Amino acid sequence: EVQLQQSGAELVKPGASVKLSCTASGFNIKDTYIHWVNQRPEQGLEWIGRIDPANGHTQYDPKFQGKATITADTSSNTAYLQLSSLTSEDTAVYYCATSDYSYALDSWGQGTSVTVSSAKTTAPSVYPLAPVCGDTTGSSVTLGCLVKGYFPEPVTLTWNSGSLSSGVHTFPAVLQSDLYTLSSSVTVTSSTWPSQSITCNVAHPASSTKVDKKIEPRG
Amino acid sequence: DIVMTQSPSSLAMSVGQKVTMSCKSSQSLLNSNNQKNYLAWYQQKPGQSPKLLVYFASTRESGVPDRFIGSGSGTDFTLTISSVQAEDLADYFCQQHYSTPYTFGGGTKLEIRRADAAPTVSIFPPSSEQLTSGGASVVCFLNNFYPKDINVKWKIDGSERQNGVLNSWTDQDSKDSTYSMSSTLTLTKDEYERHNSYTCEATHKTSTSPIVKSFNRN
Amino acid sequence: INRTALNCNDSLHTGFIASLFYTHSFNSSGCPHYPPRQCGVVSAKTVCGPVYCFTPSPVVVGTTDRLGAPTYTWGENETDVFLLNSTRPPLGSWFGCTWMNSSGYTKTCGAPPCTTYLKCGSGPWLTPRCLIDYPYRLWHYPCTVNYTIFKIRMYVGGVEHRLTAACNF
Ligand SMILES: *[C@@H]1O[C@H](CO)[C@@H](O[C@@H]2O[C@H](CO)[C@@H](O[C@@H]3O[C@H](CO)[C@@H](O)[C@H](O)[C@@H]3O)[C@H](O)[C@H]2NC(C)=O)[C@H](O)[C@H]1NC(C)=O
Ligand SMILES: *[C@@H]1O[C@H](CO)[C@@H](O[C@@H]2O[C@H](CO)[C@@H](O)[C@H](O)[C@H]2NC(C)=O)[C@H](O)[C@H]1NC(C)=O
Ligand SMILES: *[C@@H]1O[C@H](CO)[C@@H](O)[C@H](O)[C@H]1NC(C)=O
Ligand SMILES: *[C@@H]1O[C@H](CO)[C@@H](O)[C@H](O)[C@H]1NC(C)=O
């Protein structure tokens, strides 16, 4: 399973174009085929095309021609996928996968999710969720963190800079009116909080948003 | 285009047991020269990229546990797990690598069956930073319960409220095989301060009586 | 500063160094092999052109001295520059190796003789009918021009290698 690094999440306006990157490390791309696979929200997989970087030969699925052009540059050990005139049904995740003669996709990339919308990049507001003020003291306590009113995806949420791992349930973002909303919850033993500091870290690269929020009891 | 039909669409199995899912093609995948079936099986764990399990119908990819076994020929193909594990939960895709365009199956989602579990409920009244901005959201968490079927009713002063609610579910935990659910009810500051109770009611098959968590603005 | 040793002058008139510039070099009127002797140390006086060496993936070896420090002057000062000796890529650096003599024709090298390649593997030949392709495969091996090439993968020592293989079919 060789490794392939893909470009970042792209927000594209309806009608605009976008090019995706897929860089390969540990091997020469000219000894593989480079495929591009598609997956739309809660849909199956779809093969778009492939390219032989040793001679540039490209095969495509007929339903994607005119919309997708695959290229490869053995100089940078990198292949590309250019999407032209995007619509709402082009919103999906795009993978790049290697292959040998068998055309079995043996190694994939992490993916690049593309969002096609005219909506405006908006930064989230991050709120801390402390337990109810009148509450009995138990064995463990559960804290939360609300990330509301941002666009587009993704955000990144961690507790105590990643070192607080277990007992966390980060819930998938939902969308209302062009604005995502995301929550997380962490559960620790009561002898841990508020004895020790528990901070909610939220990043939204689309708006350069980097925010830390310590959970403090109410009153 | 070769059509791949996968059956069933969903599958639940307890840990340590054997499960089977089937893949069928619209034309033969058997090579006459090669006497090889050009079928591939992929596993996609939630929030991840697909991984190669089996290619050439029955050749297991290096590094894959030997409990995954591909079988079949011609037009009938099955993937089998000798003893499924709590980590095996995934969407399993069969794909033909025979002719262009290479087509995929619908996918078979594998769930894990475990012992019933009660939800741990925690309700959170809105933060102070949110109240100064003009809005108020009440959050209610429902963690580590099983099975996944569950319902939530918000009660304001004992009366049901339906608009303003937004829910979210996590994928099944790859370790304890439980489910967790978030439910956020959103108001305006004056609508929020115009009421007292706010109850988050949950009904689950693990209890005949609904689980109630409430607070007061006191 | 590059470090590659070319000492080419075809006393017998091969026309071998005429084969580095193609659209023309494709000539092999006479084609009418793999078993060698284990790699020792050659020195640039005997070499012309690059010195390819097979890990599953092809690699060129650089000029150096008696030790490992490299030369950087195109192999010319009693330049014992190519330490082609090793056991096998599970343990050592490569299976076997090929470079072109100034003769105009060259010979290969390989590990002690006897999938099955990582067991019985010396030269670039995976099987009797198949070799590994490198940019100078046509030059060092001019009778394999009609072989059909295809992509293949191979696991060796825990790392995956991606190869282009040429075969007589
Ligand atoms: C690789 O394939 C090429 C074909 O593109 C081979 O070149 C051709 O080889 C044939 C061999 O039968 C030549 O035909 C014969 O040539 C002899 C001597 O000229 C003649 O006496 C026979 O009557 C017959 O015509 C042919 O001339 C030659 N060239 C072309 C353009 O076809 C080449 O030999 C192959 N190389 C290897 C290593 O297999
Ligand atoms: C490299 O080239 C040299 C000269 O081109 C080869 O030297 C020949 O060696 C044979 C011994 O088998 C002598 O009979 C010839 O007279 C030599 N040719 C000369 C001196 O011009 C040498 O054999 C080549 N290397 C290999 C490995 O074959
Ligand atoms: C110069 O030396 C480097 C060493 O890494 C080698 O890769 C390269 O092929 C040599 N020659 C040229 C023309 O770059
Ligand atoms: C390729 O195989 C054929 C059939 O065995 C044989 O006649 C021919 O000489 C072979 N060519 C080479 C270059 O080995």
Read off φ and ψ for residue B113, nearest 5 degrees.
-95, 125
| Closest to A33 measured CA to CA, from A105, A93, A82, A89 | A105
User: Two tokens at B98?
Assistant: 């025979």
The last residue of a domain, from among A116, A145, A172: A116
Q: Rounded to an integer, what distance in angstroms lies between the CA atom of residue B23 and that of residue B110?
A: 15
- Claim to verify: residue B159 and residue B110 sit in the same structural domain: no
CATH assignment of the domain containing A59: 2.60.40.10
In units of Å, what resolution does this entry have?
Answer: 2.7
CATH assignment of the domain containing B128: 2.60.40.10
- Claim to verify: residue A190 and residue A157 sit in the same structural domain: yes
Beta strands in chain B (DSSP E): 4-7, 10-14, 19-25, 39-44, 51-55, 59-60, 68-73, 76-81, 90-96, 108-113, 120-124, 135-145, 151-156, 159-161, 165-169, 179-188, 199-203, 211-214
- Claim to verify: residue B2 and residue B61 sit in the same structural domain: yes
DSSP state, C125?
E
Q: Which domain holds residue A91?
A: 3-116
Q: Which residues of A touch C57 (CB under 8 A)?
A: 27-28
| Cis peptide leading into residue B119 (ω within 30°) | no
Q: Which domain holds residue B48?
A: 1-114
Q: Which residue of B has its CA nearest to A187?
A: B143
Method by which the coordinates were obtained = X-ray
Q: Is residue B126 part of a domain?
A: yes
Q: Rounded to an integer, what distance in angstroms lies between the CA atom of residue A179 and that of residue A182?
A: 10
- Claim to verify: residue A33 and residue A102 sit in the same structural domain: yes
- Claim to verify: residue B10 and residue B85 sit in the same structural domain: yes
Using a CB–CB cutoff of 8 Å, tell me whether C72 touches chain A: no
Number of domains comprising chain C = 1
Beta bridge mates, A8: none
- Claim to verify: residue B78 and residue B121 sit in the same structural domain: no
Q: Which residues of B touch A44 (CB under 8 A)?
A: 93, 104-107
Judged by CB atoms closer than 8 Å, whether chains meet at C162 and A1 is answered as: no
The last residue of a domain, from among B95, B114, B133: B114
Q: Are C142 and C131 in contact (CB under 8 A)?
A: no
Question: Are β-strands A10-12 and A112-116 bridged in parallel, bridged antiparallel, or unpaired?
Answer: parallel
Q: Is residue B164 part of a domain?
A: yes
Of A148, A183, A218, the CB nearest to B182: A183
Ligand at minimal distance from the CA of C40 is: 2
Which residue has the least CA distance to atom 8 on ligand 3? Answer: C2
Instruction: Give the residue ranges of DSSP H helices in A27-85.
Output: none
- Claim to verify: residue A51 and residue A88 sit in the same structural domain: yes
- Claim to verify: residue B47 and residue B27 sit in the same structural domain: yes
Residues with Cβ within 8 Å of residue C69, at least 6 apart in sequence: none
Q: Is residue A163 part of a domain?
A: yes
The last residue of a domain, from among A116, A146, A166: A116
Taking the CA of residue A106 and the nearest CA in chain C, the distance in Å comes to 10
- The DSSP-derived string for C18-42 is GGSS-SS----S------------B
- The DSSP-derived string for B18-67 is -EEEEEEESS--B-TTT--B-EEEEEE-TTS--EEEEETTTEEPTTS-TT
Question: Are β-strands B10-14 and A180-189 bridged in parallel, bridged antiparallel, or unpaired?
Answer: unpaired
How many residues in chain C?
169
Q: Which residue has the tokens 């470079």?
A: C99
Q: Rounded to an integer, what distance in angstroms lies between the CA atom of residue A158 and that of residue C34?
A: 59
- Claim to verify: residue B95 and residue B123 sit in the same structural domain: no
- Claim to verify: residue A132 and residue A112 sit in the same structural domain: no
DSSP state, B146?
B
The last residue of a domain, from among A116, A143, A169: A116
Q: Is residue A39 part of a domain?
A: yes
The set of protein residues with a Cβ atom below 6 angstroms from ligand 1 is C 28, 31, 143, 145-146
The last residue of a domain, from among B65, B99, B114: B114
Number of domains comprising chain A = 2
- Claim to verify: residue A176 and residue A196 sit in the same structural domain: yes
- Claim to verify: residue A100 and residue A34 sit in the same structural domain: yes
Q: Rounded to an integer, what distance in angstroms lies between the CA atom of residue B39 and that of residue B104?
A: 10
CA angle C91-C93-C98, nearest 5°? 135
- Claim to verify: residue B69 and residue B10 sit in the same structural domain: yes
Q: Which residue of B has its CA nearest to A216?
A: B127
- Claim to verify: residue B53 and residue B126 sit in the same structural domain: no
Which region holds residue A167: left if phi is over 0, alpha if psi is between -120 and 50, else beta?
Answer: left
Q: Is residue A219 part of a domain?
A: no
Q: Which domain holds residue C105?
A: 1-169
The last residue of a domain, from among B88, B114, B140: B114
| Closest to A108 measured CA to CA, from B43, B4, B81, B56 | B43
Judged by CB atoms closer than 8 Å, whether chains meet at B122 and A142 is answered as: yes
Residues with Cβ within 8 Å of residue A53, at least 6 apart in sequence: A29, A30, A32, A34, A72, A73, A74, A79
Chain breaks in chain A (C to N over 2.5 A) after: none
- Claim to verify: residue B105 and residue B133 sit in the same structural domain: no
CB atoms within 10 A of CB A173: 18
Rounded to the nearest angstrom, the distance between the alpha carbon of C15 and the centre of ligand 1 is 19
| Closest to A84 measured CA to CA, from A62, A69, A70 | A69
- Claim to verify: residue B195 and residue B134 sit in the same structural domain: yes
| Closest to A33 measured CA to CA, from A4, A7, A8 | A4
Judged by CB atoms closer than 8 Å, whether chains meet at C151 and A31 is answered as: yes
Sign of the Cα pseudo-torsion (A170, A173, A176, A180, in order): positive
User: Two tokens at B185?
Assistant: 């009810």
Beta bridge mates, A50: A35, A59
Ligand at minimal distance from the CA of C145 is: 1
- Claim to verify: residue B91 and residue B140 sit in the same structural domain: no
